[PDB]
Amino acid sequence: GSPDPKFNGIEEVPEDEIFVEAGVNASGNNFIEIKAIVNNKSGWPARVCENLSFRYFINIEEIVNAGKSASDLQVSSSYNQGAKLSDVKHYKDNIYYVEVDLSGTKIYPGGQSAYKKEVQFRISAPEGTVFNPENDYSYQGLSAGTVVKSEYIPVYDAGVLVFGREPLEHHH
Amino acid sequence: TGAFNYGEALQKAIFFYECQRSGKLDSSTLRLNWRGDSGLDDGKDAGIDLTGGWYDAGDHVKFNLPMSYSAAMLGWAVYEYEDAFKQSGQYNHILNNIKWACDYFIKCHPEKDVYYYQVGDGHADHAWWGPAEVMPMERPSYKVDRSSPGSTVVAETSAALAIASIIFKKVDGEYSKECLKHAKELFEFADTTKSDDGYTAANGFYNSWSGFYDELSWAAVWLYLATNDSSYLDKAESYSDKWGYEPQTNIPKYKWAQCWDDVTYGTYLLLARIKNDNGKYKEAIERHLDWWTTGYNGERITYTPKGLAWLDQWGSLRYATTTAFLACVYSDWENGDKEKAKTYLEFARSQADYALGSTGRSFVVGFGENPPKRPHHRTAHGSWADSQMEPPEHRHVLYGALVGGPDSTDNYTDDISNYTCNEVACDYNAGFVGLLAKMYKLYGEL
Ligand SMILES: [Ca+2]
Ligand SMILES: [Ca+2]
Ligand SMILES: [Cl-]
Ligand SMILES: [Cl-]
Ligand SMILES: [Cl-]
């Protein structure tokens, strides 16, 4: 006889290797501020990632209906070493997003400070303008004072989607 | 018979070497999905490409002495039992892995009398706990040369490449010739320097304890078998008075095992078959294998109650399974003592079966009943947090790894930080692969 030739070490990947955890860091009538922690717990195989980015999607319907536009939103942060934050960018319809780009920073499963990087960013409308997070795609399932893994904050590796989903309606 | 699936164990014990690969990998042909590119800057401090080779154990140092010893022993298995490898479907697998190490030894030999013998700093390497692909620390390379030589590691490398030249002759004649050229040059370098003064970066890990005369004779006898140039046979025999005697005697030493430091015992056996003159090499191998089995002149190695021949607390299974391979090879020598061959072969079977499960549990990761699941191995564990305890279970199965094994009364614990028990290593698996090939031939082929 001879051993089963199907034998291999191609294992089931039992867990999501690269993902963002997020939560509400602060909020007010006209803004939301997100705490986001990008994780690389890769194992199949482990790898170093130095071109990761993620996108946080909002719906500006309530801004437009107030007679304002995306140009009235302001992205800010006092906590973003190693992360570039975009201005709001148009996706489709009244869906916009903030890109958070950690390219140039090595994130890898090699220690407590290596496998995860925290970013904080705030999106504000003008004083007196209602900012409604409840209709924002990437706000779904977020809470104050805690971070949780979210499939609604998709992660990209050199601009290629590797985890989560973009807001495809109603269209996929 | 037999009592265990030796063919499966052999398959897995060879696969273990794929888990140890350093360098650029081809993910489209790998038999696993949890190893990636690693050590890609190996050699850059020296201005030379030293990528590839095998990580030694559960760490990421490339230690060329055990690495070349292990490739030599795998190669010796293919040389003796080629058909067993073909019938079990493991022949291309074993050659692919042996070539992984030998391609590296060639890179390590950029000029006739220059040889790189290590990549990685042992202390720095062991100070961090995570997978190979994300190593954060610098990995220095080290070389020996005519001014600062390393006869031990250069001669063991010569031997591995000489063996590679034989087993690749038919499948890749051009590579075969390349291995032989390097093997001859390395042997001349080791033989004409006779010094380990330059071999220093492995201090505390793989010191040369027995000296380099065993390696010089081992490399020379393999070069004789590779070339049929009788000058190499003369050369191997010329150091017989230098290998070592039992303390206080002129009796060729016998109370140890074939291992990464000491290849005297396999040299006895190879020379005994070549000379076939009922002479001193026959006597020397028989003294050795008698001590390990029935006893020699009233003395016998320690055995555990459950039947393991137990040489030392470190790598107990490694020493017993490697000696069992020598016993297999002896048993197949037509001119050997037939009654001793019977005894030696039954010993080899018993030691194989102890490793595979005769005590009620397997000592081979990913094989048999209740195998070890926490081998001391960074990449199989897969910590993202520089900790042996996070996660508390290994992320990957290190199939085929033979662990250190039990103490002298069969006690063993499956714990990632228990070193005598759960160390794994290239040299632990090397003789074991040859033993498994013979067991598969005996029991698994019909
Ligand atoms: Ca909104
Ligand atoms: Ca030696
Ligand atoms: Cl196979
Ligand atoms: Cl055979
Ligand atoms: Cl030394």
Residue numbers in the entry:
A (entry chain B): 447 to 618
B (entry chain A): 1 to 446
From the paper:
The effect of the re-association of the CBM3c with linker (CBM3cL) and the CBM3c without linker (CBM3cNL) on the enzymatic activity of GH9 has been studied by the crystallization and structure determination of the reassembled GH9-CBM3cL complex at a resolution of 1.68 Å. Surprisingly, the combined modules crystallized and formed a structure similar to those of the known GH9 cellulases. Conserved residues of the linker (which spans from Gly447 to Asp462) make numerous contacts with conserved residues of the GH9 module, emphasizing the importance of the linker in this interaction.
Cellulase 9I (Cel9I), is a non-cellulosomal family 9 processive endoglucanase from Clostridium thermocellum, which degrades crystalline cellulose (Avicel and filter paper) as well as phosphoric acid-swollen cellulose (PASC) and carboxymethyl cellulose (CMC). This enzyme consists of a catalytic GH9 module at its N terminus, followed by two family 3 carbohydrate-binding modules (CBMs): CBM3c and CBM3b. The C-terminal CBM3b module, as a classic CBM3, is responsible for targeting the Cel9I enzyme to the planar surface of the crystalline cellulose substrate. Thus, Gilad et al., showed in 2003 that the endoglucanase activity of Cel9I is dependent upon the presence of the CBM3c module and suggested that the fused CBM3c serves an important accessory role for the catalytic domain by altering its character to facilitate processive cleavage of recalcitrant cellulose substrates.
